[PDB]
Design a protein around this ligand. Structure first.
Ligand SMILES: NCC[C@@H](O)[C@@H](C(=O)O)N1CCC1=O
Ligand SMILES: O=C(O)CCC(=O)C(=O)O
Ligand SMILES: [Fe+2]
Length: 315
């Protein structure tokens, strides 16, 4: 689902100005301010966000297009390393991730991941690991972000400040609501609630992930075409049936400056197609944050936007 935000430029540039200019220096205060400003989001946008937050969508994502973003010459050089300087001045797409983010839930940091930071810069880096956001030339295989983590976030948000030079990088998303109808009764019943072995990403280096779970008439999805490792042949067969159904419903989003993609991390699996970086200081640059909500026990109380959580594998 897409929402053209172009006409909100002015109002959104305003709300963004309400926020502290050095977010990481005091993230709790920054996010709190963004929560206040979030109450003033244009009615239409606010409704779309609230509706998507409560109902999700058939395609499992909400793309906000045309959000304000700095002219390319006004953006810093594309980052060449992580973590980002705590002193880095606020970027507009980051502001948008704050506003829209608090409208949906709580930004959450994951200790063992990216120094336990909350705002993640997603740019390509030399000799990147195959399962990393830093890859470019190699396809970033379908994955439900941290599906093996107990505190898996409900949403993964990606805001684009800089697309790749030839704009060939495509963000893929496959929705459980479109793929499920393609599986037969046997396969669904086999998948639903069946915990299966799953490795974890490098930073968290078992875990038992349930490919499907929840209401059988509208189950959530936990899939990783890399770390999900089924045992029983019956199992492997059901997963493959799901892997194919997902490929079959694959949707492609080409992120361009001003774009903010909200991935329903409980009903989708995503990926990124190949692209060649130029190492010229203007490579692809996305901003990522994870959002937690009241849904399916991600919160136990007392949580605040900006909190960093430890790792506990599902099982
Ligand atoms: N398919 C792996 C996802 C990749 O993006 C990675 C990272 O940030 O390097 N990541 C997010 C959580 C985690 O380990
Ligand atoms: O580069 C992209 O568009 C997607 C990267 C990704 O999978 C992620 O940051 O979770
Ligand atoms: Fe991802």
């Amino acid at each position: 689902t897409s929402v053209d935000c172009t006409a909100y430029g002015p109002e959104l540039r305003a709300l963004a100005a309400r926020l502290p200019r050095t977010p990481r220096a005091d993230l709790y205060a920054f996010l709190d301010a963004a929560h206040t400003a979030a109450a003033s989001l244009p009615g239409a946008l606010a409704t779309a966000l609230d509706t998507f937050n409560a109902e999700g969508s058939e395609d499992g994502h909400l793309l906000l297009r045309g959000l304000p973003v700095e002219a390319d010459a006004d953006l810093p050089t594309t980052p060449s390393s992580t973590p980002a300087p705590e002193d880095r001045s606020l970027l507009t797409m980051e502001a948008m991730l704050g506003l829209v983010g608090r409208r949906l839930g709580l930004h959450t940091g994951y200790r063992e991941l990216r120094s336990g930071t909350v705002y993640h810069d997603v740019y390509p880096s030399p000799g990147a690991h195959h399962l990393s956001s830093e890859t470019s030339e190699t396809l970033l295989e379908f994955h439900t972000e941290m599906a093996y983590h107990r505190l898996q976030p409900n949403y993964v948000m990606l805001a684009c400040s800089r697309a790749d030079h030839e704009r060939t990088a495509a963000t893929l998303v496959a929705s459980v609501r479109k793929a499920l109808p393609l599986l037969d009764e046997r396969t669904r019943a086999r998948l639903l609630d069946r915990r299966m072995p799953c490795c974890v990403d490098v930073a968290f280096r078992i875990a038992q992930v349930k490919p499907l779970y929840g209401d059988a008439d509208d189950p959530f999805l936990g899939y990783d075409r890399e770390l999900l490792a089924p045992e029983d042949p019956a199992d492997k067969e059901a997963v493959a049936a799901l892997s194919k159904a997902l490929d079959e419903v694959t949707e492609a989003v080409y992120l361009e400056p001003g774009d903010l993609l909200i991935v329903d991390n409980f009903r989708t699996t995503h990926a990124r197609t190949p692209f060649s970086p130029r190492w010229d200081g203007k490579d692809r640059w996305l901003h990522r944050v994870y959002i937690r909500t009241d849904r399916n026990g991600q919160l136990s109380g007392g949580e605040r936007a900006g909190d960093v959580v430890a790792f506990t594998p599902r099982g």
